[PDB]
Design a protein around this ligand. Structure first.
Ligand code: ANP
Ligand code: ANP
Ligand code: MG
Ligand code: MG
Ligand code: MG
Ligand code: MG
Ligand code: MG
Ligand code: MG
Lengths: 336, 336
């Protein structure tokens, strides 16, 4: 048996590898809070009356620079976002770089400058790092770890029947923008990735409704909105009913996705949060998101239900329903 | 200008890149304690009356499995050791893996099993991670970040005139074992890497003499003992006088290094600590090391002096002295 590209594609195939190989081989998996067996966006560790949150992502996106972002902005954003969706204020990042021999020095400078600019948006410092250079023809991989502090960690397993399901903005932008760039699809301008840190969006909701009323979050990265909704449903042992017409999709993204033959629900987003909130606080949460720039296109897209546990239903027309199927993998190679 | 293999070799060339490109491009570099500008083994962050310590290393060693270790044992050991030489008890690791398409599943399982076994030695849990798969022909890179807690962080810049300089064991084992394996050099058995976590050694000294009497530490990884001693001297603005005959070198390592034409002082070690301690506590520190298994071959090798600031002197014969020159880079490719 061999490792396949699908094992790195964020869908069912990767999930099976994590359950059957990673979780079964590693034995020391928790430091006292949310640990590896939870397979959540990060881990938590009790510290005083708060919690340290710890997360890591490798970044292998191609090309290194793309419309709306680059591997540097992605490395900072993705790790800040995994902290944010655990309910953690980012306090420090670590920057590992693995660089291909022969890369132009200006490319490294540009990636670093983008990392710094993006970090400054949060704000969060890059306090430690590492540099390796290999003869392999890889250009560059960037691996960021993050530490945050949460007063009240938010899991991906806390959804409750009756809760509202929100997304912080348009769906499909990153993956569709990336594929469009590769394929020479563009409109008046090129479609831009949404890659950005969204701690500001999460914090805005928390300050409005309180952490206790945010029941679940995930950032819909590899394998998309569909993967994120299916995982929350599965982990929370609930069904999720989504009204398809309420999912925000940029018109240019819809058009390009049609031309590409790719579902915008199944591709990574890089500047979004899926949030599940107490029913009575749904409108306040939505308003809090929409008051921010990065959450300006936020929408309530569905609700948590007691049946179809572990499944996601898509409602269309005047009431019809079908399943939103979780992808076997993100269909966009090297999306991340 | 292009990135060269030397930029990843841990010596003067890498150091110049860190000073002239990394530190000059990043602006947010500290979270309140030791930060990026210190270029120390990790960063520190005040938390309550203690300090969170944060570090990261990428691992790109070839081959993945070698005598005495593998990329998994290396990934856990190297990051635990960077925490330990900051004075931090390891509390959590993060495991990023970037895997080449086509790698045999059994290789991944073996690396994970080695990571777990090594983590169990500390003990420290692997609480979070990431998996990416690329089509590039890389086999595997493993990137570990670590969080530790220090009551009293130890810098690489705290050496004081009069202090004793210790090493926790034999010098040159990892780099020389690796090159010997590549070149088919072996004795009755193959030379083994020393790769191992050495938090136990550091902790043993601290429990004996107190953190305040441990003035500086570094693990002598890429570019070796010479690099580590030169960096401590430079950062502390002191000279270091070393008696060459007192540096422990395994007989097989000396022989192999002669055959290879490589200095054992200039190659990475992966199970060692260089420690600078208060003069009056030198013998207690040494005894504490030698009582442990991993520190069984520890030795006092020199002393900190007021002249030759930023330099390292090697004493031979009956008193003669020359400089221990810092390498431009570790001479062993893909050592780490
Ligand atoms: N190689 C690995 N070793 C240990 N834990 C892992 C590894 N790969 C993934 N995990 C864990 O598996 C879970 C799912 O990881 P992952 O899908 O990377 O999360 P994510 O970062 O939120 N999504 P993405 O940004 O697409 O990578 C998390 O709890 C990770 O900590
Ligand atoms: N790409 C990078 N970005 C930010 N900081 C970096 C980067 N590379 C190295 N650093 C910092 O530069 C200093 C020297 O790093 P490094 O030489 O990797 O330390 P080390 O881990 O103790 N030795 P080694 O195990 O051989 O890598 C540390 O303070 C790192 O945090
Ligand atoms: Mg996530
Ligand atoms: Mg992520
Ligand atoms: Mg390093
Ligand atoms: Mg170190
Ligand atoms: Mg290191
Ligand atoms: Mg990940």
């Amino acid at each position: 048996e061999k490792i396949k590209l699908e094992h790195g594609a964020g869908g069912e195939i990767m999930e099976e590898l994590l359950r059957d190989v990673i979780l079964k081989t590693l034995t020391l998996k928790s430091a006292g809070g949310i640990g590896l067996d939870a397979l959540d966006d990060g881990a938590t560790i009790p510290f005083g009356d708060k919690h340290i949150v710890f997360t890591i992502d490798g970044h292998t996106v191609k090309p290194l620079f793309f419309p709306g972002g680059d591997i540097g902005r992605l490395a900072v954003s993705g790790t800040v976002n995994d902290l944010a969706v655990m309910g953690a204020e980012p306090i420090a990042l670590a920057n590992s770089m693995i660089i291909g021999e022969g890369l132009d020095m200006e490319v490294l400078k540009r990636v670093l400058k983008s990392m710094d600019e993006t970090a400054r948006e949060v704000p969060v410092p890059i306090v430690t790092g590492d540099t390796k250079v290999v003869e392999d023809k890889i250009e560059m991989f960037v691996i960021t770890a993050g530490i945050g502090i949460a007063e009240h960690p938010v899991s991906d397993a806390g959804a409750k029947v009756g809760d509202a399901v929100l997304v912080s903005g348009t769906i499909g932008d990153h993956g569709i923008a990336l594929m469009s760039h590769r394929e020479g699809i563009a409109f008046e301008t090129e479609l831009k990735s949404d890659v950005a840190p969204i701690w500001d969006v999460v914090k805005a909701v928390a300050e409005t409704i309180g952490w206790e009323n945010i029941h679940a979050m995930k950032d819909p990265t590899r394998a998309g909105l569909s993967n994120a909704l299916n995982e929350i449903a599965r982990k929370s042992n609930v069904g999720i009913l989504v009204r398809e017409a309420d999912i925000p999709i940029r018109p240019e993204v819809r058009a390009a996705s049609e031309m590409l033959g790719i579902s915008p629900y199944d591709v990574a987003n890089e500047g979004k949060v899926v949030m599940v909130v107490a029913r009575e606080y749904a409108e306040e949460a939505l308003e809090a998101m929409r008051k921010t720039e990065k959450g300006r296109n936020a929408a309530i897209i569905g609700e948590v239900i007691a049946d179809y546990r572990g499944k996601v239903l898509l409602e269309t027309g005047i009431g019809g329903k079908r399943f939103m199927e979780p992808p076997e993998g993100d269909p966009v190679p090297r999306i991340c």
